[model samples]
Target: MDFDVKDFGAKGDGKSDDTEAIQAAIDAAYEAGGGTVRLSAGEYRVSGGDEASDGALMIKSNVYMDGAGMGETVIKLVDGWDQKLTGIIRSKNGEKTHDYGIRDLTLDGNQDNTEGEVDGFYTGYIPREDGADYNVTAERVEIREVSRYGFDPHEQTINLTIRDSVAHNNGKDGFVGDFQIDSTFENNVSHDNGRHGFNIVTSSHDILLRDNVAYGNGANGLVVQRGSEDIAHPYNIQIEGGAYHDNGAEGVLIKMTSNASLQGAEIYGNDAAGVRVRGVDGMQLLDNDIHDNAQGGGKAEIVLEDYDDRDGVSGNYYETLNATVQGNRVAGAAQLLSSEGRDLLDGAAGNDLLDGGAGRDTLSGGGGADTFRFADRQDSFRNYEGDTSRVDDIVDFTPGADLIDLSGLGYSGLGDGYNGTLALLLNEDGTKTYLKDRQADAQGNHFEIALDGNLVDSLSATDIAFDATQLELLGTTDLQ
Candidate 1:
């Protein structure tokens, strides 16, 4: 069924107060078992009513509002009845799983006459304890110049999809997701807002942001985090193919999240780092172009602040196994990359594979069987803090059904007549062992290799072999 605003006394003349006429049409459409309310090309100046009632254009289940086109039929908020919140279009306590949508429309907040927070597209809170207008979608929509967020979808909003939209120059955030989860936001642009272009919070989960652009915002371009202990941490969110630049702070700030991946994003020219991660776990930063950032003394491309658990001299050091890292090209810019948690990577208590991707990395296989791949050669692995520069690096090789692979550095024999390579010998201290490569790199340098003596029972000849054999090369030489 079609509910035409013109038939409901809407003049759409750009100067007239079309509030009542348009709302009446929407009300009529919902009353008729759900239908489309069509607004043709023209400007419709909207004003809301008293605090006792909701503002203009309230949507119900199975309701859709289709404009002739963005800018062709504009919904401008000229006045409001409530001082707390004024929405040009809103949906509150609507039927869940019933599909409510808006398409091809422009919502203008007309901040000149707005007194308080004004939202262009407002999806109201469903008192929680319950839940959507589930599967709510906004396509080809432009929300601008609002007193507050351009799109505010609150409590229990799930499966939301916002695409091909623009939200810019708002007084506050461009888009906000509070208790919104399992949604998709794609091909959208949010810029020049008073706060983060997109502030997704309250442990919203599994949200996907794709091919979006956020720039010139008052704060970080995008933020996804858990605000309180009561809130669950967001998980498995993926940000891909986006450009976030020239923001007031971090281009993207992720905290208290886990198992998330940020891939193929171009984050640059921002006042802060390209991406800042804190207190996160199992995050994957893949193939992103991050540079020319940290304008305000922030770390450059990425900062993994608390992932280190610096192992003390006698502490049983732990590390992760199979730490897979692909190319994330964070060279000259924002290159201060380090892990948080235990400077040690503690693997699970089962068989595992861990690759210390970069920096002075350490690994520990907690239990069962494990494999350690030393991808960073000590010759090149300079401790960012400067102490040990040689392979003098220590590996707490757990004695179990475990293996350590040194194939990463092209291992050869290291003993007299042991293929004419450097020989392994017990140090003067009598407990430690070292590989006298007695050889220098292209830069003319060689150093001792320190293997954790207590962890390994011996440095015997039989246990030393090429890492390619995939055998347990135990350092079992009884100490002299």
Candidate 2:
């Protein structure tokens, strides 16, 4: 059965207060044990003074709200509401709700007319509890111009799916999942928000953001983090086949997470690093197109840092461990900085800057003129005896086109009068070459780079530079 709001005395004329009329229709549908409450093609204005319904339109369980179509049937807040509005729509029972949804409608928060914080849609109450809302869905819904988050689902929202939705121009994040679980956001567009386009905070798990586009936001396109120390860290978060670009901050920022993977994403043109991973474990960046990032004085296109106790979290071990970066296309003189773990930094194409910072790393420059930068001696220092396992390996070193940068090692008189300070030794089989710093070796510390393939015979005078200023004077002109 379908309960029409117009039949319940709602004037869909864009001027009348349709709050009571729409609630009447919804109540009738709920009394009849689950039916569709339909809204016809018109602008239905609401004042949101329904005190019994928590000052918003309360959506009951097992009741599906159907609108004529997006842009054709709109639900907007009326102008001049004195008090702060909670939201345009929300669940009737936040403690235990199930099997409810709103489809094909535009929810306008009317921020200019409203005061205080207002959101477009919310699955549950703020200050989320332990109870869960299960089996909820929102399809083809457009939520915009809200004072806060557009689609805010909190608490333990399980089996929630939001697809083909658009959330933009909100005061805060476009979409937020706070303490959520087992949710999927597919093919959605979230952009031009005051903060992040999409935020998954608190203890969210098994959340998949697939084929989504997030851009032109005030902050990062996507952010995943544990909002507090008391909550569990987010894990098993997967982002696949999304285009996150032109944001004010990093394209994607992941911190204090576990088992997170970003695959097949085109992240570019951000003000900071394209992807910044910190205090995470089991992270994988595979087959991504990352380029032209770090435009706002950031150091690298992708930065991976070891876990630290900055936020009162205690962990001394390298939490950014067991991560892999492979088969990714990084262009436009980008830099990939590694962590203090064994990492594979593969710049699949273009002239890239691979900096293996403080770890045993494998740097692969697939094509173009590349720079292998060792910023400090500890970046490639041996930690133990017979420490062949902790050596940095440069797999593909084109002598004429590639250059090794040892500027941060603090060697004086480099490329001036000092020629015997650095030694390039070739193996007997001519298949391996070693670069040893004599000054560091004389102080009972060893700093070496093992080139996997033979490059001793083709070594050029400009192939390696001992100072940062001399790297540009070498073959590489684009080191920024």
Candidate 3:
């Protein structure tokens, strides 16, 4: 479908209110059972408000808005907020899948007194609005030189994916979102922005941001907000596998709720902590290195704030958190300082500070001379907070409902190994938790469980057992 505003009363020259022509094409595409809508290859620009006009193009449904190269046709930003780009393409709810995609395209919104606001799709920036009202995807798309946000898909818009794109020198954020995107950011590059490379309007889930690069931005490389509770934000959802470097602040900092797991990731050479998480919950931070980021931020490692952005870093501190911390190494005196959780403290290769705060905890120096700091709210509660302080707390942590026993257990000379194999068991009640056979890490500090000493009856690590799965979930649904 060709939209020559001149034909549909659009003035046709690029500086016209082409709203009618644009909408006409979209409507035609919808009627044709969904397909591509071609915007004839000419400069499409709305120079001024022309208050009498409704706005520019608004897209909906599974349709594509192809740009005829940057020179010929472009969706621009008009001056003085005269026009709310309203997402160059405003999607509605009725469409079977509101994945209105834009590709092989160019959106130049760096106009006079107007920029960045040419949103590709609704990412819930407005009230009474459930986001784009659909799932939107963009590929080989470039949103350059603008103000505010670019490529934002929020709330109601699920499963949004954007790759091979570029957002340079935007005024606010390169990308803004909520639970609105499960989207993937691949082979994309962002630089010189006002805030983060991605300023999540709200937290999200299954949001895979991988192999993307961010340079010269104002804040952290990425700032994740509070995610959804129905497994929408952190449960079952994962924000893992990515690289962050040279941003204005912390490389990758997620400081909100913490039911999420950040794994197999790398963050370095930023102005702050390589990877900083403040005010999060039940989250497991794994396999990441912190170096050189503390040049400016208080800690080169972490700041465990309470549950919320506004709370202090030491508020919701859980020294022995519910998750397992294994095979992670942190260096530098300025790194790896904690007060709320037991993070396996496995500095398998380097020396680290394992600060044990509040609860009964486990500190493991996997190997080498790993140091631990055991302190309570005031250290006055001695009898209540005494463990003889060693590498790991000598307790088994298991999680399954069924009992898998292997007490024949083992027959090692000194039981001085790292990979100890043993039978495990679990009680009916969700009370007993165990991590058995925790052979001394490369650090030679194998803290065994109590077999039946002053309390029970076994000898080899408390007849240990473990729950195979780490996830603690509730309820069920119809889909398999």
Candidate 4:
């Protein structure tokens, strides 16, 4: 309950005119019903005035606008404001601006004589309709060079939380959430802005962008968009454990957004495609640690590249129905992680590793006891569908606990397997297992070995083992 705008005369002297003395200390803390309007360490020079009965510095319900640290209490917009100013701090009394907050400030949008648009916190969009903006928050704030957008919310909000904030060099977007509902934007650090360093436009849904770090942005460090919505279609989004680097494009892009999920991301050295999915739905790309992303050099780690599945008449994304690709660690010591069309590279639940770097790839090893790494010989592996038994994919025969490596097809098993043109079979209800290369090359190419899983009732020559020997069968149940 301390309303100190220099006791309503405000001369935090960075040249007087503290805009009606900080709106007379926020109308004396909203006529003594709300609280905290302190601004301790100097330099408060805002100009413009009268925006729906007095512009800039307006927060109502149980308010708080404290600022002492963050370049030591600075809020300078400088000169004749009001060119339709929506923010220098505004919370348009919607839902009575209840449970509001704007902490440790520094909103210096002094873009060389501000004549118009200036935001550094604007939740403006009143109770014109079913107003609901509950428990809003912006902590440790620092929004600089803003001519526009630096935390500008658009309609319907709930339990929003923005942490350890720092929305950088903004002219636009350093957090511009439009159509937000149920939010959480964590550990924020938005950079180089002008656009997209966290921009969730239209139809936002159950959001959670954790451990945030949006870099040198002009675009894409995080973008969940939908310019055309049939029914509020930006479903339950979750972009976890962040580190989206050198971004200008696709470090984390969710186009035509839908039921999204991009887990544990580190997505390094990006200019594009560390993670880029066009048209999505029921999506989940888990446990990421991608690398040297591409715009050029080292051009890929994960790019399901435009699943123009024709938006399947309004449901949007669909490459493999309820898509889920897991345990990603695409460091590419040489490069392998490409799926352009017929998609389904599912792998999750610890111990599941992958490398399906070519076309015609189909894998699904959802549980532990999984490993699908191959470098040639036409890909394909099946298992775990014994009525949804769930071990799903990698048709592995348990040779000391799961494995399917074709020695990258350069064949140095030093003979025997490659020497005999490699042929290992067992799939007439033996729960499946077959390696083919009875001979067909020069493009006629017939060399199949698309591993799958089996848990007993057959396969026992210690159940198939290549580069490490263990394949000594000539036909009919060979186990010795």
TM-score of 4: 0.38
Cα lDDT tens digits, model 1, 1-480, are 789999999998878898889888878888898889899999898876565126567777777889998888899876543365545687754446357788889998888666767887766456445655567888988899888889877666788889998899899989887777788899999999988888888667888999989999989999877664444667778888889988999998877676667789888888887777765666666677777777776433455443332352222222222222345555322222233222334443334444444444454444444555444344323233334443433355544455544555665654552333655666566565455555545555443345555433354434343454534444221110
Model 2, position 149: C-alpha lDDT score: 83
Q: On residues 32-93, what C-alpha lDDT tens digit does candidate 2 reach at each position?
A: 88889999899999877545236478777788888988888899888876566665787754
TM-scores of the models, in the given order?
A: 0.68, 0.83, 0.65, 0.38
Q: Following a full C-alpha superposition, what root-mean-square deviation does model 1 have from the true structure? A: 13.1
Candidate 1 clashes: the total is: 32
* Better by lDDT, candidate 3 or 2: 2
Per-residue lDDT tens digits of candidate 4, residues 257-294? 66789899787776766777665655678888877767
Cα-based lDDT for every prediction: 0.67, 0.80, 0.50, 0.65
lDDT of model 3 at residue 303? 40
Q: Which stretches of candidate 1 lie over 4 Å from their true place?
A: 79-82, 94-97, 307-325, 331-480
Candidate 2, 92: how far from true, in Å?
Answer: 4.7
> Lowest summed-lDDT stretch of 10 residues in model 1?
314-323
Ranking according to TM-score, highest score first:
2, 1, 3, 4
Better of 1 and 2 by TM-score: 2
